[PDB]
Amino acid sequence: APTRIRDTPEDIVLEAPASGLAFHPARDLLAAGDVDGDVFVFSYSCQEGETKELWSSGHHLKACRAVAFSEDGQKLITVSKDKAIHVLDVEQGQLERRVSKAHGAPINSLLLVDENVLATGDDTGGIRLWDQRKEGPLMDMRQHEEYIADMALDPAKKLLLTASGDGCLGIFNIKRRRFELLSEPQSGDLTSVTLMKWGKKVACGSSEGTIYLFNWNGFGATSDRFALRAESIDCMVPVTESLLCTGSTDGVIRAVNILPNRVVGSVGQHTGEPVEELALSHCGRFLASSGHDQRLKFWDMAQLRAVVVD
Template identity: 25%
Template sequence: MPVEVQGTFVSQKINKIRWIPEEYVETTCFFTGSYDDYENSIKVWTLENSNEDEEIEYPRTLSEFPVAGDITEIKFTEKTRIAVSTSNGDVRLLEVSTYDKETPLREIHKWKNLHNYGSDQCSCSSLDTLDGDVVTIGEDGAIHILNTRRGQVSVSISGADSCSLHSVCFIKHTEVITGNIRGHMKIWDIRSNSNKPAASFLLAGDEMAATCIINHPTQPHIILAGSESGSLAMWDLRVNSFPTSLLNAHAAGVTEMQFHPENPQKLLTCSVSGEVWDWNMQAMTKSTMGTEHQITTWMPLEDQNAMRVNSLMPVLHKPINTLHCNKGKILCGADNEAIYLIKNFKY
């Protein structure tokens, strides 16, 4: 079946969108987080057919949780709990009902003014989660590790960076990687008492912000970063002095990336230039015999013409800020106040 794209106007600029996972049935519910509105909110939606004879599914709002400030990130800490960061420096832990998605979201914890310039507010620009722990970063250059079970701040690195931090990713429980507005990437050992990074390197030659960072689901030593210029950089952290591969990708900044949960050879990216792309990662890996006869997989700089990239929907004239895939369905949220559902994606 060909890929279908269906857009629905929702009267809010969508900054983050996330499918809500289900155990034994195909999920139809998802979260959205808005920005640049008089009152922003996190909404729970469901996809439903308005007519039984139609195959078109329209999103319908089930519940709404008002939030002060713009939503900057939404990540799951458990199957029914999400960590949410906002532009006023707050971080919330919210829970959705397992059985009744129309029940309003419940606030479990709130870390108020976690990121600040003293008495002045500043944005909590991003966060990442790993097994109940949350790492947050902000425009104040600070890093905080939150324990969601106890509702405590377990580690704080207040002067981690002199620049505004844009992106963050857990490498493992004891290590996180951050990217700042000038493209400086730093690895932090959160067990260390020092406020200095364990390693640091540049995203690229020009000073472009690292807009998003993820690691490979099956090879956690491989890190991908999207830049403000639209390029994709890849590192093998075993040799972390420079990107193993740097690909000129989108025409403008990369806003979000996700590996398909069931096929790590599929990478999805969206951008400020209004594009949603599907990358074949198999063409970017090469196996060689290492010194001790082990197989080493790395990202080659050469053979970039072998890259296979598909555009999944017509280019919009507004930024696509977010995407999230679940099996053959991909959700996208954009600045044109619409939600897009891409169906029949082959993974």
């Protein structure tokens, strides 16, 4: 009394723009990592006043480019232009493990594979796989020629898929610690990669505003492409097996259906400011976006998930 409720959590206003963004797998927590290296965990709620910073930490002294929560919800893993990988505890953001010198170049991309294994990708295209129980990387692959923009995981956890600024989709066999192939290079930098259609399609967003599709186990060349009415796609996240959201340098977040390929419409925008990253809540209800306006914004996915069909 008074309880003031909205349809989404309030915007989170940051002091520096954030490339790192992830939702907790079981709790109403959102993590961000910013261009100064700072990392934050926020509680979020549709009740006004109840979206609050729970902790911040300043262990990285250069840009924190990606963050991810462990599957058990206990740890937050962060990577940085300082070339380090850190393991933090979710409760307080205390540093529990520091893996410095993890790459020879700034780390841009992070993907957790299982409770002991993760992959990192750097600004020169280097890909490494790590088991926390073994010293040194399991794999060191430099077939890519430009930065690793994004990575995705085979549901069977066999293949790691990579999107690179060299215009290629990369395929690595995690189980065999080996390179399989690079796709034919595309005209746009591949900024984003996600699995769609129950793992049967690979969707990659490009710096020219195209989405490329590849068939599963046909990674060598695209099976389809279509363009948005946008100059770029810089980040994507799947909402359903057919629907994903994109963020672009024009600041607009777009809902896009795959096969049939259609722009459903605009979810929202960071007016006139590039969208840097997206994430989806564990419950599926909220999309979060991080923009160059230094805001984390929440969007209700219910209207979409209703309208949406196989």
